[PDB]
Design a binder for this molecule. Structure first.
Ligand code: CA
Ligand code: CL
Length: 123
């Protein structure tokens, strides 16, 4: 769920408020997405978007009427390291991995304020 993703990002980037810093950024960081990523961070979000799309197509995910952003899974942050729980069922585990990968990706790429609240004309 979004609440967990927010926590994961903070786990990797302690100084951030993810739902603010990484929302409405570039062409893919936020709800939906289209076009060519404007930078590596935007690309992290495109990959995350693609991961969610793959998830929704999994047999295990079609069983729950909850979208990836509302589907709660279990994970832990410790020493700024993210660990997806073995107690997660197939769908939740896949989503957890998608979020973990994105959180780590976000923490390894540059952040360009110029792309915050990007004109969707550029997408
Ligand atoms: Ca376009
Ligand atoms: Cl990690």
């Amino acid at each position: 769920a979004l609440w967990q993703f927010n926590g994961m990002i903070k786990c990797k980037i302690p100084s951030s408020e993810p739902l603010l810093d990484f929302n409405n950024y570039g062409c893919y960081c936020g709800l939906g997405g289209s076009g060519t990523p404007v930078d590596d961070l935007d690309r992290c979000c495109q990959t995350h978007n693609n991961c969610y799309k793959q998830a929704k197509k999994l047999d295990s995910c079609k069983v729950l009427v909850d979208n990836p952003y509302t589907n709660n899974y279990s994970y832990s942050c410790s020493n700024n390291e993210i660990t997806c729980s073995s107690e997660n069922n197939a769908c939740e585990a896949f989503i957890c991995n998608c979020d973990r990968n994105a959180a780590i990706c976000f923490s390894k790429v540059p952040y360009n304020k110029e792309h915050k609240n990007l004109d969707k004309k550029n997408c």
